[PDB]
Write a structure and sequence with these properties.
The structure is cut from a larger assembly and holds chains A (57 residues), B (117 residues), C (115 residues) and D (129 residues). Helices cover 12% and strands 11% of the residues of chain A. With 57 residues, chain A is largely without helices or strands. Chain A has one domain. In chain A, strands 1-2 form a two-stranded antiparallel sheet. Helices cover 70% and strands 0% of the residues of chain B. Chain B has helices at residues 8-19, 31-70, 76-83, 94-100, 102-116. With 115 residues, chain C is an alpha+beta fold. Helices cover 52% and strands 16% of the residues of chain C. Chain C has four helices and three strands; from the N terminus they run αβαααββ. Chain C has helices at residues 14-31, 38-55, 60-69, 73-86; strands spanning 33-37, 96-102, 109-114. The N and C termini of chain C lie far apart (35 Å). Chain D is an alpha+beta fold and 129 residues long. In chain D, a hairpin with a 5-residue loop joins strand 2 and strand 3 (109-125). In chain D, strands 1-3-2 form a three-stranded antiparallel beta sheet. The chains are: A little secondary structure (57), B mainly alpha (117), C alpha+beta (115), D alpha+beta (129). The A-D interface holds A 21-23, 25-26, 28, 36-37, 39 and D 35-36, 38-39, 50-51, 53-55, 57. The complex binds calcium ion (CA) (2 copies) and magnesium ion (71 copies). The site of one magnesium ion has 3 residues of chain B, from helix 2. Chain B binds four RNA strands through residues 1-15, 17-18, 21-25, 27-33, 35-38, 40-41, 43-62, 65, 74-77, 89, 91-93. Chain C: GO terms for molecular function: rRNA binding; structural constituent of ribosome.
Chain lengths: 57, 117, 115, 129
Amino acid sequence: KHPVPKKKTSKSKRDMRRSHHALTAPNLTECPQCHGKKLSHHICPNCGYYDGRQVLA
Amino acid sequence: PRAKTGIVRRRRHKKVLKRAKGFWGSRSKQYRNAFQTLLNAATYEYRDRRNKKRDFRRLWIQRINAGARLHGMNYSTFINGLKRANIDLNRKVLADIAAREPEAFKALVDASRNARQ
Amino acid sequence: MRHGKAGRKLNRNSSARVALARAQATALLREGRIQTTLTKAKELRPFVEQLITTAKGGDLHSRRLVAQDIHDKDVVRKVMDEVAPKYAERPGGYTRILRVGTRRGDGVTMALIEL
Amino acid sequence: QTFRNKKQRKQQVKLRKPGFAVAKYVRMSPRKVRLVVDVIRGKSVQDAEDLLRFIPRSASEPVAKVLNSAKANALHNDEMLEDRLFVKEAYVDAGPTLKRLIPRARGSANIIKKRTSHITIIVAEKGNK
RNA sequence: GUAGGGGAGCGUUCAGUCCGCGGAGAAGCCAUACCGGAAGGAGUGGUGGAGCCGACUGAAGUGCGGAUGCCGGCAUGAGUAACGAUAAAAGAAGUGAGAAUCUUCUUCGCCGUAAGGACAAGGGUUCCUGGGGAAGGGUCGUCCGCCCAGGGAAAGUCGG
RNA sequence: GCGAGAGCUAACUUCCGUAGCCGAGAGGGAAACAACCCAGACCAUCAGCUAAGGUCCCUAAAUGAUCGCUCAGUGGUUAA
RNA sequence: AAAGGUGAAAAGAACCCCGGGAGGGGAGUGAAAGAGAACCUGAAACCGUGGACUUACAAGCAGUCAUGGCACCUUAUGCG
RNA sequence: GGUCAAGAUAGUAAGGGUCCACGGUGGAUGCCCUGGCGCUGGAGCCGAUGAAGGACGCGAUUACCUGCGAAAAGCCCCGA
Ligand SMILES: [Ca+2]
Ligand SMILES: [Ca+2]
Ligand SMILES: [Mg+2]
Ligand SMILES: [Mg+2]
Ligand SMILES: [Mg+2]
Ligand SMILES: [Mg+2]
Ligand SMILES: [Mg+2]
Ligand SMILES: [Mg+2]
Ligand SMILES: [Mg+2]
Ligand SMILES: [Mg+2]
Ligand SMILES: [Mg+2]
Ligand SMILES: [Mg+2]
Ligand SMILES: [Mg+2]
Ligand SMILES: [Mg+2]
Ligand SMILES: [Mg+2]
Ligand SMILES: [Mg+2]
Ligand SMILES: [Mg+2]
Ligand SMILES: [Mg+2]
Ligand SMILES: [Mg+2]
Ligand SMILES: [Mg+2]
Ligand SMILES: [Mg+2]
Ligand SMILES: [Mg+2]
Ligand SMILES: [Mg+2]
Ligand SMILES: [Mg+2]
Ligand SMILES: [Mg+2]
Ligand SMILES: [Mg+2]
Ligand SMILES: [Mg+2]
Ligand SMILES: [Mg+2]
Ligand SMILES: [Mg+2]
Ligand SMILES: [Mg+2]
Ligand SMILES: [Mg+2]
Ligand SMILES: [Mg+2]
Ligand SMILES: [Mg+2]
Ligand SMILES: [Mg+2]
Ligand SMILES: [Mg+2]
Ligand SMILES: [Mg+2]
Ligand SMILES: [Mg+2]
Ligand SMILES: [Mg+2]
Ligand SMILES: [Mg+2]
Ligand SMILES: [Mg+2]
Ligand SMILES: [Mg+2]
Ligand SMILES: [Mg+2]
Ligand SMILES: [Mg+2]
Ligand SMILES: [Mg+2]
Ligand SMILES: [Mg+2]
Ligand SMILES: [Mg+2]
Ligand SMILES: [Mg+2]
Ligand SMILES: [Mg+2]
Ligand SMILES: [Mg+2]
Ligand SMILES: [Mg+2]
Ligand SMILES: [Mg+2]
Ligand SMILES: [Mg+2]
Ligand SMILES: [Mg+2]
Ligand SMILES: [Mg+2]
Ligand SMILES: [Mg+2]
Ligand SMILES: [Mg+2]
Ligand SMILES: [Mg+2]
Ligand SMILES: [Mg+2]
Ligand SMILES: [Mg+2]
Ligand SMILES: [Mg+2]
Ligand SMILES: [Mg+2]
Ligand SMILES: [Mg+2]
Ligand SMILES: [Mg+2]
Ligand SMILES: [Mg+2]
Ligand SMILES: [Mg+2]
Ligand SMILES: [Mg+2]
Ligand SMILES: [Mg+2]
Ligand SMILES: [Mg+2]
Ligand SMILES: [Mg+2]
Ligand SMILES: [Mg+2]
Ligand SMILES: [Mg+2]
Ligand SMILES: [Mg+2]
Ligand SMILES: [Mg+2]
């Protein structure tokens, strides 16, 4: 019992694990009603529109 | 009087480390693998120098019979026939004569063949 | 595997995923809209939607069926006397979801369920 | 243009840091903050403000407050025009490290590393090109 | 050419004497393609900001890769395992820079010879009020048994 | 390797004698390979000759010359 | 147990800017802030950002020697 | 020149490596002294008149140290 790693990992080999840790940028879009900032199939957080006003802000 | 190690050890270590250029990994950065790699590298440098003499020997020869057989005789029945042509003795890197002037290496082929008759 | 199961464990046992959907249904009808995690809103929809089709019955039987899911007599009267009659034109579209932002403690997308 | 020595130059010229601000000792792990900072890097400075309100990582908050400070210094102190601005450089480095013992099974402790970050951003005009 | 014997030497600190150098910049540090047969030594540049080289002689806590060696720092495992009982939680309202976590309301579930209450040992301000938010809290935190300040503790008859 | 005992005329066995090598011996050969074959490395050379061992291609060098032999892949695994 | 060092002098940073703060950027002081209170120097391991040359049919004690390619030119146009 | 065939050969880097440049971490190295070590030499007992060592207190504001003791960071006399 008790597996434990055998040699230390090289900086090269460990950094090439992390080859897949890249965050995906949000695909943002321009609110047609507010000024800008909006996430798709969601309300515009600033003005509250989702064709007219929804949420209070 | 105390006499601590200071400045001495870093200087030595830095000279070892600087011998490590594009050594891979911790070969270039940790002193202990740098120095250890250098022990084996000593082995290689000396052996190789002696060997490089014998390696260019080989490249020499391998061009010379390629030209020789281009003229219809092998290395063996050629460097024989120059030496049997005695005073003809130019020997050192006939390779280059075969590799650049063929008008000359053809004449040396004719000389060797005349000597073997 | 589950090739045709319908429904959600909500990382909850049998007793709780009902007492959830009952308690959430009581609040939607008591409030018109509520804001909750996007998933609970997706499961909350058809249960509340069926429950108001029960109340579209009018008679005492439908009232007592609604009562066995909704234990606050006031909300019972609201759905029974106010809302369901308002919807009696309405082939079942009684609920929509919008989904708002994404919160900050646990990073969960959240949403509105409304009438 | 060429000075007499170095004591020379320290008097005559003062080093200054156009477009640059830094948050030191931010109490977060550098490799995390690096995930989100990499999302910023080289984007037009508006997008960077735009991307950071929707990236759902906790590090977005400290990273945005640095970016605004960089935008601010480029304008107030360095008198750049802000429709040219973009993030020329951004990069996070280690800070100190708080440590605690945390008891474990059978009696042994471990040391756990609460890591900090020096998050820095450097904006410049896109009048390169 | 191993143990081993022999020879000539390099570098470090301190001491004596000499030759000197230093804010127009010293030691130390950093780069480097020069030099010597080696240990090594110089040139130039960058850094530093107050001491120091060379020669001859003397004395040593004088030369590290190892010792499951010591002290310290930092890595790998890895964004992994875990986040400490399977007694659930939901909505509205509020406060705030900021809220799944703080306050309120209304429900829900859990103990009920207890997971309610009153004492003794033991602890020592943890109590209440007003503030705070570094760290402590296994997340957050506007909250806390955490931090700051101010109050609170009453005996002829209870216990000594 | 040679000469012997012990052993099964076993053993990369053990114990004496004797020479050489390794031990402390780098270099070429034996595919790889302390001991076997050649040979004992003061330093440099993009010069030449040989040793053991080699000269079809990996892989430096005769697909050498003259007589034969084996048609088994013998070569490239023992015997009655 | 670990223990240290702004600057000659506190002149210890008024005021402005982003930020709840923390942190920073300016302006000032000072010879120096390339000394700012996580305050002399600041090596190495370790973490990063940028650049040159490279790498997605490869078998690798990580070198060594040989030759081509591409950069570069401050003991330096070379035996670099 | 355009199709068709045959053949050869470049650039992409998800991420890596060597080098360089620039920083972060961290506290070696140099310099420094407020702190030690030793030898030499002085001096060498204190207490029932309360010792050595403590406890509690004394400040406008006082947690620590220092000094002091309800006359309590001190009171009287003398000399500088
Ligand atoms: Ca993961
Ligand atoms: Ca794993
Ligand atoms: Mg087992
Ligand atoms: Mg070799
Ligand atoms: Mg020859
Ligand atoms: Mg099953
Ligand atoms: Mg779960
Ligand atoms: Mg309402
Ligand atoms: Mg029906
Ligand atoms: Mg039902
Ligand atoms: Mg325990
Ligand atoms: Mg100088
Ligand atoms: Mg040097
Ligand atoms: Mg000075
Ligand atoms: Mg010693
Ligand atoms: Mg040793
Ligand atoms: Mg060691
Ligand atoms: Mg250790
Ligand atoms: Mg557990
Ligand atoms: Mg709640
Ligand atoms: Mg508000
Ligand atoms: Mg916050
Ligand atoms: Mg909870
Ligand atoms: Mg609570
Ligand atoms: Mg209310
Ligand atoms: Mg109780
Ligand atoms: Mg008590
Ligand atoms: Mg008490
Ligand atoms: Mg309380
Ligand atoms: Mg209270
Ligand atoms: Mg309180
Ligand atoms: Mg906090
Ligand atoms: Mg504080
Ligand atoms: Mg916390
Ligand atoms: Mg009474
Ligand atoms: Mg009594
Ligand atoms: Mg026998
Ligand atoms: Mg034997
Ligand atoms: Mg031996
Ligand atoms: Mg020998
Ligand atoms: Mg040999
Ligand atoms: Mg051999
Ligand atoms: Mg061989
Ligand atoms: Mg063999
Ligand atoms: Mg053998
Ligand atoms: Mg050997
Ligand atoms: Mg020959
Ligand atoms: Mg022969
Ligand atoms: Mg050949
Ligand atoms: Mg033949
Ligand atoms: Mg000072
Ligand atoms: Mg700050
Ligand atoms: Mg400030
Ligand atoms: Mg000035
Ligand atoms: Mg600075
Ligand atoms: Mg400094
Ligand atoms: Mg600070
Ligand atoms: Mg000084
Ligand atoms: Mg410093
Ligand atoms: Mg980078
Ligand atoms: Mg790079
Ligand atoms: Mg392939
Ligand atoms: Mg390829
Ligand atoms: Mg492989
Ligand atoms: Mg990439
Ligand atoms: Mg550090
Ligand atoms: Mg010094
Ligand atoms: Mg002293
Ligand atoms: Mg006393
Ligand atoms: Mg007092
Ligand atoms: Mg006291
Ligand atoms: Mg008195
Ligand atoms: Mg007086």
